[PDB]
């Protein structure tokens, strides 16, 4: 369990139209909750909380 910019496949963030979308996705993954730094770090990412370490993080590099 950690915080993470959650990714899909690979290192690419999901289509956070609304903050809720990301909290939803995040909780679907069995995490605590999430939210979307639009005007914040990474800039339009999906932050998830208590994401189990099994699921990787959006590293500050490529997206495939």
From Swiss-Prot:
Residues 2-64 form the LCN-type CS-alpha/beta domain. One of its GO terms (molecular function) is toxin activity. GO terms for biological process: defense response. It is found in: Secreted. GO terms for cellular component: extracellular region. Has the structural arrangement of an alpha-helix connected to antiparallel beta-sheets by disulfide bonds (CS-alpha/beta). Exists in two forms, due to cis-trans isomerization at 28-Asn-Tyr-29. Adopts a predominately cis conformation. This is Toxin BmKaIT1. It comes from Olivierus martensii. The lineage of its organism: Eukaryota, Metazoa, Ecdysozoa, Arthropoda, Chelicerata. The chain holds residues 20 to 83 of 85 of the full protein.
């Amino acid at each position: 369990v950690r915080d993470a910019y959650i990714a899909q496949n690979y290192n690419c963030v999901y289509h956070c139209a609304r903050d809720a979308y990301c909290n939803e996705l995040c909780t679907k993954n069995g995490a605590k909750s999430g939210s979307c730094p639009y005007l914040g770090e990474h800039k339009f990412a999906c932050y998830c909380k208590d994401l189990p370490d099994n699921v990787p993080i959006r590293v500050p590099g490529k997206c495939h």
